[PDB]
Amino acid sequence: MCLKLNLLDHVFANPFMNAAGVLCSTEEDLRCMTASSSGALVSKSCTSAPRDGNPEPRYMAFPLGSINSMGLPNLGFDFYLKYASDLHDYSKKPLFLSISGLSVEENVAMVRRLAPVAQEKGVLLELNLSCPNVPGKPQVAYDFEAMRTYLQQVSLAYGLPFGVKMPPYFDIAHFDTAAAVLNEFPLVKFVTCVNSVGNGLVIDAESESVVIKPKQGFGGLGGKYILPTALANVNAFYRRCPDKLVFGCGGVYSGEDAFLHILAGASMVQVGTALQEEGPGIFTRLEDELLEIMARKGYRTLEEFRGRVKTIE
Amino acid sequence: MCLKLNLLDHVFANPFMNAAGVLCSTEEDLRCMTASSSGALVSKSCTSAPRDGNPEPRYMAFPLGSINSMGLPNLGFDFYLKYASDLHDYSKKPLFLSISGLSVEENVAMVRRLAPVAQEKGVLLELNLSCPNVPGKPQVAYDFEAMRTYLQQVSLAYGLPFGVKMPPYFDIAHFDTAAAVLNEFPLVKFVTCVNSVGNGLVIDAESESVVIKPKQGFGGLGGKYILPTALANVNAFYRRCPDKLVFGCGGVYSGEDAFLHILAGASMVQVGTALQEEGPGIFTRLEDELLEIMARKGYRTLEEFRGRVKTIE
Ligand SMILES: Cc1cc2nc3c(=O)[nH]c(=O)nc-3n(C[C@H](O)[C@H](O)[C@H](O)COP(=O)(O)O)c2cc1C
Ligand SMILES: Cc1cc2nc3c(=O)[nH]c(=O)nc-3n(C[C@H](O)[C@H](O)[C@H](O)COP(=O)(O)O)c2cc1C
Ligand SMILES: O=C(O)c1[nH]c(=O)[nH]c(=O)c1CCc1cccc2ccccc12
Ligand SMILES: O=C(O)c1[nH]c(=O)[nH]c(=O)c1CCc1cccc2ccccc12
Question: What start-end ranges are recorded for coiled-coil regions in this protein (chains A, B)?
Answer without folding.
Answer: none
